[PDB]
Amino acid sequence: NAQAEEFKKYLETNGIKPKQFHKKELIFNQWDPQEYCIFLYDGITKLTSISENGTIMNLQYYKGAFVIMSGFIDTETSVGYYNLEVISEQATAYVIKINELKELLSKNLTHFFYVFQTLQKQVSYSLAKFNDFSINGKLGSICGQLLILTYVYGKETPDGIKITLDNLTMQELSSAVSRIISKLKQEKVIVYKNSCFYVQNLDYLKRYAPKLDEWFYLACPATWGKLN
Amino acid sequence: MNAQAEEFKKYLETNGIKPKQFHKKELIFNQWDPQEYCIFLYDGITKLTSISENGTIMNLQYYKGAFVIMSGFIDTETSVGYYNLEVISEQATAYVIKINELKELLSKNLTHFFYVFQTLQKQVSYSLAKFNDFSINGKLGSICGQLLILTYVYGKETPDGIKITLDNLTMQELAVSRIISKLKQEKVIVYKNSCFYVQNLDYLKRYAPKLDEWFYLACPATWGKLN
Ligand SMILES: O=C(O)[C@@H]1CSc2c(C3CC3)c(Cc3cnc4ccccc4c3)cc(=O)n21
Ligand code: NA
Ligand code: NA
Secondary structure, X not given: OHHHHHHHHHXXXXXXXOXXXXXXXXOOOOOOOOOEEEEEEEOEEEEEEEOOOOOEEEEEXXXXXXXXEOEOOOOOOEOOOOEEEEOOOEEEEEEEEHHHHHHHHHHOHHHHHHHHHHHHHHHHHHHHHHHHHHHXXXXXXXXXXXXXXXXXXXXXXXXXXXXXXXXXXXXOOOHHHHHHHHHHHHOOOEOOHHHOOEEOOHHHHHHHOHHXXXXXXXXXXXXXXXXX | OOHHHHHXXXXXXXXXXXXXXXXXXXXXXXOOOOOOEEEEEEEOEEEEEEEOOOOOEXXXXXXXXXXXXXXXXXXXXXXXXXXXXXXXXXXXXXXXXXXXXXXXXXXXXXHHHHHHHHHHHHHHHHHHHHHHHHHHHHHHHHHHHHHHHHHHHHOOEEOOEEOOOOOHHHHOOOOOHHHHHHHXXXXXXXXXXXXXXXXXHHHHHHHOHHHHHHHHHHOHHHHHOOO
């Protein structure tokens, strides 16, 4: 992306170096009193919360380029007790104290609008998922999640739309969930060929995840028009 | 209400933006509006709805003044999503502003720019907490999460319990009567005077733990008034 590239280089101009992370590493953890603005240039991360019996809660996933912030920008107080785990093999991320963020954006409104419209997407993204889930239950949630893997990591092939994901990432991902995927298999909306995963009926996914499909058209139109 | 909100209100007025009185059931904006707005809900209560192709109305989110609700992207001024913003309180004060004008106002005042930025952070992190509590305790954490918000916001320190202040207009504004019953029975909620009370705030905290954390970090003033 161009906007993200302009932010990458704007960060480096101001002396902020990238930092390579590896799978299962933590970019920041819930006990770090320092609040950060993570610019995940490349890689895949997940935001986890730990209940007080030890159970890890996978709450959200992020793909670079994107912005994650552990503190409110105004008061510089914590958004919550969260960790940012890297689940890809290797992820690049610019780590920035929240204090320095306000200074970088105060000088330049353009990158302020970039970070600002990024949070705008995340808000509407969640509203669109919740919408589809309230209209079609888990069916909408499954089709919506499946629509992500198609619009982003998808590519057109003879056997449909293949998911360009190292199966290391795939299995990173239940009775009712099996029922849904089962029907998708029998209707061949998806497949299991060559150990891969292809999507052949994108129109089906759009039907039961319509609001999320709208979110792409409005927030990621270049990706949306690719497979449309 | 919020120190930042009051100054933002003054800031909008001094730049020639007038408040507008919306009453219950009015739409500050609907989903077929080709103009994208930045709504500053100063006072009142609203909900974000969506009409499907079937014509089915879906509630998606609730907002209470002071708060910001933008329908378009700050940069491209395009819609982030086709939503309607409906008032559900008796009356509501809101400062309707074009998005192109917002871009202008926040550019000359980074302080208010950060404030609007923070209102997005509270939505995102409010959703994550709500999603965690539902992702462990299912609908129990959701209802308890919703009740927890009502308790912290509209509660009263009455020896009877915690008096939900909401005028009846938004109380019953609201498939799972087992949940309301499992709490009606358990001395967790009681409508003594025809009005809801709370006799066990720890039940709600226990099943909405992340929402409780969020409220402790986002509204620490309101959180401690019951703790
Ligand atoms: O199941 C998942 O892993 C995905 C990834 S994150 C996510 C979300 C939102 C972004 C955090 C949602 C939306 C959602 C669904 N149901 C809810 C029920 C109660 C309260 C909030 C909810 C939010 C769905 C989803 O599947 N996933
Ligand atoms: Na933290
Ligand atoms: Na709008």
